[PDB]
Amino acid sequence: VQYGECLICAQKFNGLTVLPPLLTDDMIAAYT
């Protein structure tokens, strides 16, 4: 399984961005 993001960071001139979740995949994996 565009917009501003960060993994180093980068931004776009369209004013759009996506925020991260509280729970990361590893934290989810721990629960499962």
Added chain:
Amino acid sequence: RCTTNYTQHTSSMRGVYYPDEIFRSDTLYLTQDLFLPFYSNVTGFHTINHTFDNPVIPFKDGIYFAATEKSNVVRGWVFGSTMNNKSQSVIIINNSTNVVIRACNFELCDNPFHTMIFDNAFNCTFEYISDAFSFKHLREFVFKNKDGFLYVYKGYQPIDVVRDLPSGFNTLKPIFKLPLGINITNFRAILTAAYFVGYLKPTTFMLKYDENGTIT
């Protein structure tokens, strides 16, 4: 001074060119412009023995031109309206050492081909001469009118054909944008081979741009 077959073919996927001076990379771009339609009806002309095709051909706001050479028979073109010294017209030729472009009220030869193109030139409004220089070859051109300018594209590839125009495709690159300011409705080919004329249409195309920004 002056000394005085329309075979139809297929355009294949030829007549493609870069629509603008904008760099792109790794992307599909959809647009519309005066491009040669795919698999359109292309008119062939020949220069064989006693028969030399050099008729006045309608421009229709933009045409596709190609020619197959082994002896550089085709030297240039004349674009204009009345095609005489009544008004402006432009002569675009390979003058054998330089490319020469002039827009004037030319008293043209009825059967042009020594440089026998016109006897006189009046009221010249534009002149240009390129840098000096000195079937086997396919030459491709696109001629478009825009805001008084004659936009010219050029391309080239090696060939091995006798009479036909080999199927395939090629993206052409711009070479001239001439601020002629003249009325081009008709044109003639200037001969010292075979050549082909198509017509451009405001057709929608999806163009595939590669990593280096070229069209593949």
Added chain:
Amino acid sequence: TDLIKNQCVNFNFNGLTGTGVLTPSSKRFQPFQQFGRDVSDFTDSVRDPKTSEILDISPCSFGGVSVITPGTNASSEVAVLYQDVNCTDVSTAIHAD
């Protein structure tokens, strides 16, 4: 004027204006291309009219700023979060307001 690089500037190229950060690039421009664009309809890079060098144009850092507080009936204190920004630039632009 000389090129001012690796910082937000107000630029004016012969046909392209705006603000942002100029950095060198390797974009494979053709002999008949002056500037390029991103996938979306925004300027990506420009060839310099004097030196013929090609530089990319990055946006100046921006985003949402939020405050973290306890209740005002408990205490008066606050932490400030600058979304999506390298703290090196945040700090620099505080000292260099």
